[PDB]
Amino acid sequence: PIVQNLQGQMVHQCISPRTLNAWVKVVEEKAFSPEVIPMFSALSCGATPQDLNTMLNTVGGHQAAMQMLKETINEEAAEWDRLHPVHPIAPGQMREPRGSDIAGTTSTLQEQIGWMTHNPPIPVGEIYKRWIILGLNKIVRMYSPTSILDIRQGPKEPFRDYVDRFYKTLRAEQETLLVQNANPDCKTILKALGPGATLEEMMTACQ
Amino acid sequence: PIVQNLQGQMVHQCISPRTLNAWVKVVEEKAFSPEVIPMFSALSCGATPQDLNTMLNTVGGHQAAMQMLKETINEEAAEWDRLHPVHPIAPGQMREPRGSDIAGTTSTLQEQIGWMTHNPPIPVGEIYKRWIILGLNKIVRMYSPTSILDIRQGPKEPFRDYVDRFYKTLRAEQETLLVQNANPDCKTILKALGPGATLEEMMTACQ
Amino acid sequence: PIVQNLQGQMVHQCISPRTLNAWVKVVEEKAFSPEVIPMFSALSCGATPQDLNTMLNTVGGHQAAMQMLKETINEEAAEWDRLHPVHPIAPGQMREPRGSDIAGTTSTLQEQIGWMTHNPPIPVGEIYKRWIILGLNKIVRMYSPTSILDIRQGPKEPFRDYVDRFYKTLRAEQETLLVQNANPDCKTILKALGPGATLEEMMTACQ
Amino acid sequence: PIVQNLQGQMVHQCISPRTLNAWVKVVEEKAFSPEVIPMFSALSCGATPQDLNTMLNTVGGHQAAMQMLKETINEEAAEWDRLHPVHPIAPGQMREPRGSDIAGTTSTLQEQIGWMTHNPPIPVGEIYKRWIILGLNKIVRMYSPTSILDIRQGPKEPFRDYVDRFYKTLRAEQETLLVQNANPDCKTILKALGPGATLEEMMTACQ
Amino acid sequence: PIVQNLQGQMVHQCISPRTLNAWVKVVEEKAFSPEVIPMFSALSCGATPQDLNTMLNTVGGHQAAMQMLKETINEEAAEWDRLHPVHPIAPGQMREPRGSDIAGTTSTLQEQIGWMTHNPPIPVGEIYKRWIILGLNKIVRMYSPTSILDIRQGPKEPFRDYVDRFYKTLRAEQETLLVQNANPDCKTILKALGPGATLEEMMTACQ
Amino acid sequence: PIVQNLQGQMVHQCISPRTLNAWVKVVEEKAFSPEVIPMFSALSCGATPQDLNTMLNTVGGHQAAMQMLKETINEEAAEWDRLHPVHPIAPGQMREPRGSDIAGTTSTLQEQIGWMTHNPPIPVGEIYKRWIILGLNKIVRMYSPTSILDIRQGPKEPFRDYVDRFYKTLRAEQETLLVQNANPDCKTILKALGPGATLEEMMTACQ
């Protein structure tokens, strides 16, 4: 990553074994459950494009997913090139990043450091991270196991467990249905609650 | 988080994998037992709003709870806007944070750093943390399993185990009842103790 | 905690996840065995009152104990107020800490930092830690399982195992009895040893 | 490794136990699955040739592989010597690295530091790392268990699991075949999709 | 401990949770096997007397041992007082440490820091550590399970396993006997070896 | 160890609990398999003689081995004395290290720091480490379980597994035999390969 040092200057630091291992095990244990996205974002804090590629490439499984992510990345890089075309460079001068440069495939670590620490800085790490998260959200939605239409409170299911399933599914797929899909008893209670009830009030009512 | 460096200046540091993992596993293992609140508070020491959202969003389960927390957060943000309305910004000048800015949803990391390190500083991280803890306390109370009225010393239950259950329940729900709910033998001893007895004296008496 | 930095100035640092986890697991595994006291003291090295409350409040069990500790703390705070009464503050000036300020319940983190780093410093963290350890010693003594009078060497118990139990119990409860409570054979050997024998000499004699 | 310090100067730091252990366990658990290559690259961030030899030599198993890697390394060193022949050195002056110097077998740590921190720097660590990764890719390909021709969707295999196997195998071996090797039902769906379908569209179609 | 900082000045640092846990688990797993002594010495690198007492006091078991250690410590403190008697102190001046001061029982942390960082420094941490290791060696010898006279090579015991037991026992208790206690076959081989044989030569001979 | 600080000066740092534990567990798990040597070398990066003795002495088992290592060390120290005899020292001046000084048995930590940070520096840590590794290689060879002559490919053993055993054994003991010891089928294939075949080509041929 790029991080600030005691002297107050942005400098490159090696990605730590703890971060690498953390990402790899997150993916191993959670697959593409939605909460893996914020974790990724936090673990790639300050990441260069090289670091983002390191994190993605250290994943051993889910290679269908990783190829889909390559597709998204290439699409976003093509659009970047459409918006920001690039014009031999002047001796010793910063060149303009193209899509494959932001994705870290045609740019060196040193060039990425130069862009990210330029004044004004070109945050190629954050732009690339945005593309990656776009692709990852596509994957989260794709691997969502169940439709919100199929989450219905069981006849003996505590209302809390049902709401947990409901908003877990809703998060993967990225509230009147909540009442509609409740079971008869709770549905009666919630119908009686009236309009404008908070989720807190509903969960207390069916407790 | 924002933390002080050797030069004595407040600077942003990436949230560490150890902190993220610690929060996630705390929630996995303890759910919303009351002691999870102080842990959260300590793990979010120095947190920006972005960091607080990272911690909350990396939780994969308890999505009913997390939605309730969103409700509380939005309520507090609305009140903040009621008290501190906001007035294009002057070029290069700090803008005033609104509720969604303090919650980290309409503000950037850089803006949050600027507020938190301004002189005088606007501690958006601490204000947001306060809202979050308010919501979390609502959740702790909601998920409290048992009423203090139903904690009664068993006929063979050591007094210590009963007091542990009593104050654990009291903490979740957020002392004469202690004697009232004791079993006959201990209740006789404690009645004989007289008024003004410390908990120490009561636990020794029924030991 | 408050710790010294490279510049040689006392500054506040966030309590680390390793320390929090260490305390919580210490309590989980050892309950109030006496050795938990020194561990606490070491883990709270440099602690502000806020940090001490964090450590105590992250304990989920033993809530009878924690309430007793609150009682001790309040007693010590009352005595502090008896000895050091407090007299609106002068603009921008340090106010005098009262008992609840030292216990971290009516004082802010910033005020605690100011006291602890003042010249001369008011070590509210160490004063509070003293009160906490007083209460904790009360708890260790209370939860001591056995009286030293009931520790007696078994007819086939190695003398070493008996001495281990004897001084473990003595430590919880906070040497001629050692001979008295030894078994007949070892008791004969130790009686023959004569007066003034070191524990080493006694353990070798009955080896 | 060589890393930047607060003063802004490149200095040598000892390889950490966490990095060593991480590499050793990566190899123990994953053998030469392709994702071990990026992990290696990240764990050897900033590595001197000495550090690279340390990482390779701490591997206890797979000694056939490690010998093959020695062969590749020696080949690349021979080519380096072919391109950059070396000409007693001038007193106190930097000598020119030869192949065995870049591989860390005839050069000292101090010489490697001098090359890597020279202005202009001679990045012997990165050149050597390139040779090592070339050999390692040869090994990944060699130990690839299955030909892409033998990855065919099972009659009841979810399309996702089949694509995962397909691109895992393709990665080890280093898309119309994807349709060709799909099972009859999915193959019909994908044939109907028409040309130009993204992998996302194909996986949704056969979901 | 006391350690050097970037400014080059000796300053006090809190004992780390990793060190505390390491010592406690070392004792839990190895009891007083001889190798626990060097580990202690290394874990108490730079330790103040307070730190040494922390390490000793966090041990929950082996309280016979810990009392014996108190006896040794008090003996050494008495001798220190015999050699270095102490003479109200001059205002603001360093006082002379007595035995109980070096053992950390009548001296404050601040006084210990002052002694250890004085010019010339009075290394109370190292003196105390010496006393502690003296007592600990007494304990290692006491808890040694077996006499070297009773270590004899079994009729089918590999010579290596026998030598391992022999020097393990010798280390606890703190070479012609090696041949004498070997079994008949190996004893014949070693007798034939002649005088002046290295342990290497003996182990190869009986391999 | 001795390591460079931010100010750019070589200073002593305490050996870390992670390094100590790493060495101890390496030895516990791998005994004297050859790969333990590079690990040792890396874990003792920057080590003083005191640190090397700490690492060796914290090993609880393999005391035959450790005594043999003492023998090697003493031999090398005797040779050092033969080559570099030593001549009361001049007040305040650096004395010349003798063999037992380099082995850390007659020299203090402070003297070792002085030698290792002198200009020119006397690298007693590296000289001693060399002696230690010489002894350790003797031990690796001694504890090698099998002769290379006894490694022969099984009639159903994959060629890869056989080469792994072959070069593992060769490494412990410190290529035409490879063909000679292969099984009949693979031996025919490799004989047909002709002269000059790389190990890669041989392993592919018998795959």
Ligand SMILES: O=P(O)(O)O[C@H]1[C@H](OP(=O)(O)O)[C@@H](OP(=O)(O)O)[C@H](OP(=O)(O)O)[C@@H](OP(=O)(O)O)[C@H]1OP(=O)(O)O
């Ligand atoms: O490999 P790293 O990511 O750099 O981890 C280190 C390491 O922590 P762990 O070994 O516990 O992961 C240090 O531990 P030491 O062995 O040096 O003691 C610790 O320093 P502390 O001893 O002060 O805990 C430091 O933590 P800190 O950030 O508080 O300096 C932490 O670095 P990260 O926190 O960046 O992981």
